[PDB]
């Protein structure tokens, strides 16, 4: 059980029609636990997972503090952005940020992240060593100079290796029953004739957590990586996930194909046969 904590933030300017839209969410693994929305009436950081509600009014105040501050910083970042590339104040622009830390099973620091996108393209990110940034263009160069001059990294490195992961453990302990159990996929296969010369095998996986999953289709034991319709994994909307995989099969050959399923909630990987 490797684990991750992530925050995502999006700010979208509305030239003319108000301040930027700002939306922030947090995740332990594929479970969202908190959200901020500037448009919502509550104007606080809000819970989205039963267990984070254990936290005191202290935590709510301070988290609201920070997400609020960040949203203001975004407002200015959007303004600065236009200035850097000389863009119209009439266009709508999007500003995104990811932050988090990864721990292994023992609970110890693996990885830390802090990266940004402007208009959906990489802008600036903290390198893996956590001591320098990677800047995607000349605008982001300027941002980087400031950040080195300001010695921002020394703070981020420490925060990630220190407080981020400490926060990760504590959430994992608190939201135990939920975050630490792993739900396995209920699997099955369906058959859908489409002509007199061909039929469709579709392999399902349902009710699984976490979202990480591999569906693979074989013929005679030979991989079929090329001839396989695969859907992007998708949430049930009850905290589980779903995926499926499909192959067009020459009528009479259904028995030549097998379906393979890997998921860390399965002791053994599965072979499914029609």
């Amino acid at each position: 059980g490797s684990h991750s904590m992530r925050y995502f933030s999006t700010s979208v300017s509305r030239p003319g029609r108000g301040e930027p839209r700002f939306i922030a969410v947090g995740y332990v693994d594929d479970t969202q636990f908190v959200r901020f929305d500037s448009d919502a009436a509550s104007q606080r950081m809000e819970p989205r997972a039963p267990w984070i509600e254990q936290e005191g009014p202290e935590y709510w105040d301070e988290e609201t503090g920070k997400v609020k501050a960040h949203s203001q910083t975004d407002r200015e970042n959007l303004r600065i952005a236009l200035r850097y590339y000389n863009q119209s104040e009439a266009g709508s622009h999007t500003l995104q940020m990811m932050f988090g830390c990864d721990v292994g099973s023992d609970g110890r620091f693996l990885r830390g992240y802090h990266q940004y996108a402007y208009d959906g393209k990489d802008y600036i990110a903290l390198k893996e060593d956590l001591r320098s940034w990677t800047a995607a263009d000349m605008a982001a160069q300027i941002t980087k100079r400031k950040w080195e001059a300001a010695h921002v990294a020394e703070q981020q490195r420490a925060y990630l290796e220190g407080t981020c992961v400490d926060g990760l453990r504590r959430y994992l302990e608190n939201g135990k029953e939920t975050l630490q159990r792993t739900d396995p996929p209920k699997t099955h296969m369906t058959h859908h004739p489409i002509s007199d010369h061909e039929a469709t095998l579709r392999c399902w996986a349902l009710g699984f957590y976490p979202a990480e999953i591999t569906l693979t289709w074989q013929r005679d034991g030979e991989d079929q990586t090329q001839d396989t319709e695969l859907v992007e994994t998708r949430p049930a909307g009850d905290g589980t996930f779903q995926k499926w995989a499909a192959v067009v099969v020459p009528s009479g050959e259904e028995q030549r194909y097998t379906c393979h399923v890997q998921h860390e909630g399965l002791p053994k990987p599965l072979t499914l046969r029609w």
Partner: peptide, 8 residues
């Protein structure tokens, strides 16, 4: 715990 962050 949400991050502290800095101006571009």
């Amino acid at each position: 715990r949400f991050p502290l962050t800095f101006g571009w």
